[PDB]
Design a protein around this ligand. Structure first.
Ligand code: CNC
Ligand SMILES: [Ca+2]
Ligand SMILES: [Ca+2]
Ligand SMILES: [Ca+2]
Lengths: 76, 400
């Protein structure tokens, strides 16, 4: 019912992009989209598994700012 | 005493909501407005199924543009999108959500760096957006470092540098209130508590003899903040009743046309504020808004407005004829059509923002100020202010 290259959330009837198709996020209310298919600056720290730098103050702040969540993994 | 605004006439509230209603069908990214969605959800009014489509459009636009668009949204607008999520009883979540959060955190970190350890440097945007960003993160229970909060604290605390509007102070106060209610930044708890009282006092001391806080368009946000906490020792009740009187007069005189302004006022009229987004009540009953059946008589009268720009050499000064009821923007269009005048605007949540005049764009900490005679700054933008016959409108490049 909706344009090709966009998945349609079946219960909602709403239409969402394929990038979001099988991408671990629940973008549809019906969750149909899922089962259906460099130096760091001073004061910054590098994410363990990637290129990314975050400020030191983002360590242990309750939110995963690193792709691998390594900035909160150490905290325990 | 408490800041209470007794319920206004339902008819009067309804006609405010009907001004918002046409925007529910304008889903293009240049027109998408998270503040409109928030204001409506916090109001006593609703647009039914249109709301769900509106939120869906917001989610599509903001997530694709910022993670994957014509003039994608700003970080300040991303903050308001976060408020929109709370208005639907959602927490920002998933991998796409986490990334959006960190982008907003980067915005705050960059502004902190721009301000500096000394606090002389300005933010690249305003302290209003700085406060809005802290609030938005706090509403989703996302924490910011004490060093980030410190810049907002210093901006309002005694012996602070610069001068902030009522709007900016109110937004700061809302951010401080969310931090305090969430027990965030406990190492700044006493200063946060003191800052809230400071903002209260400065807003009360900014009340005009008419009853507005600062001006008619600062009053809505000011009231939102004042409603969130008691103010012992002060006569907050009296001040707020006087504001209601001022607000009522302004409403009956058609002051509130702009959709963003209405979206900031509607929560107040429903006894709600942005702080109600900590524990949202999404299923509270709201009256369905129907389109105002309403004729559109054209005027028959011609008016002439003088447009002038003295900020450029050679200066511009021309008498422009338009239909009565035309906006400043209509005058600008007509001037452009007559030849010898150009200008540029950019989209914002408040509507078209004037960025350039006759080839001259506003630079850092500069803007094109709108004035009427004599030397009186407009309280509305080019698309909302409707000049009277014989008026002189000036565009003036100023530094702030
Ligand atoms: C900061 C600020 C504020 N301003 Co100015 C003030 N003082 N503003 C802007 C500043 C922007 C620059 C900057 N670096 O931040 C500043 C000082 C240059 C600006 C300009 C003035 N402002 C003005 C007014 C009247 C509006 N502004 C407010 C939005 C008043 C705001 C207060 C409020 N209650 O909202 C305000 C405190 C916060 C806006 C914000 O950041 N929102 C959050 C952001 C995420 O949303 P946004 O849509 O993307 O923000 C953009 C727009 O707001 C645009 N913009 C700013 N003001 C306006 C006004 C209009 C009418 C339009 C269409 C766009 C803007 O600037 C922002 C981009 O940085 C408004 C409530 C303020 C008020 N209480 O009087 C009012 C607006 C009243 C209304 N009926 O809509 C001016 C028209 C004054 C004048 N006579 O010239 C003028 C705009 C002229 C123009 N060139 O078009
Ligand atoms: Ca998905
Ligand atoms: Ca973190
Ligand atoms: Ca207006």
């Amino acid at each position: 019912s909706c344009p090709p290259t966009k998945f349609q959330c079946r219960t909602s009837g709403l239409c969402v992009p394929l990038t979001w198709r099988c991408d671990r996020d629940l973008d549809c209310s019906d969750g149909s989209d899922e089962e259906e298919c460099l130096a760091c600056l001073a004061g910054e720290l590098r994410c363990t598994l990637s290129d990314d730098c975050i400020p030191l103050t983002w360590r242990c702040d309750g939110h995963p700012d690193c792709p691998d969540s390594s900035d909160e993994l150490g905290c325990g | 005493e408490m800041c209470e605004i007794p319920e206004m006439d339902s008819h009067l509230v309804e006609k405010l909501g009907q001004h918002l209603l046409p925007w529910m069908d304008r889903l293009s990214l240049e027109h998408l407005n998270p503040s409109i969605y928030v204001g409506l959800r916090l109001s006593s009014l609703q647009a039914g199924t249109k709301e769900d489509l509106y939120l869906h459009s917001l989610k599509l636009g903001y997530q694709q543009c910022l993670l994957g668009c014509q003039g994608k949204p700003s970080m300040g607008q991303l903050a308001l999108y976060l408020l929109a999520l709370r208005a639907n009883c959602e927490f920002v979540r998933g991998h796409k959500g986490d990334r959006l959060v960190s982008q907003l955190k980067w915005f705050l970190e960059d502004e902190k760096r721009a301000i500096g350890h000394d606090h002389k440097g300005h933010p690249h945007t305003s302290y209003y957006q700085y406060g809005l960003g802290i609030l938005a993160l706090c509403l989703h229970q996302k924490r910011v470092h004490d060093s980030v909060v410190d810049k907002l604290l210093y901006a309002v605390e005694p012996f602070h540098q610069g001068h902030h509007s009522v709007d900016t102070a109110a937004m700061a106060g809302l951010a401080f209130t969310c931090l305090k209610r969430s027990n965030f930044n406990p190492g700044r708890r006493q200063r946060i508590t003191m800052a809230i009282r400071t903002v209260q006092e400065e807003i009360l001391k900014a009340q005009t003899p008419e009853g507005h806080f600062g001006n008619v368009y600062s009053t809505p946000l000011a009231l939102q903040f004042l409603m969130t906490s008691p103010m012992r020792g002060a006569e907050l009740g009296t001040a707020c009743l006087k504001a209601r009187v001022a607000l009522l007069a302004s409403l009956q005189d058609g002051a509130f046309q702009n959709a963003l302004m209405i979206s900031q006022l509607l929560p107040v009229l429903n006894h709600k504020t942005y702080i109600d987004l900590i524990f949202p009540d999404c299923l509270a009953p709201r009256v369905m808004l129907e389109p105002a059946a309403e004729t559109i008589p054209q005027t028959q009268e011609i008016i002439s407005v003088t447009l002038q720009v003295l900020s450029l050499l050679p200066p511009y000064r021309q008498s422009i004829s338009v239909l009565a009821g035309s906006t400043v923007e209509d005058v600008l269009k007509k001037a452009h059509e007559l030849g010898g005048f150009t200008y540029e605007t950019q989209a914002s949540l408040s509507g078209p923002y004037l960025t350039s005049v006759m080839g001259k764009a506003a630079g850092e900490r500069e803007f094109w100020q709108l004035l009427r005679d004599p030397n009186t700054p407009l309280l509305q933008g080019i698309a909302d202010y409707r000049p009277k016959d014989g008026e002189t409108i000036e565009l003036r490049l100023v530094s702030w």
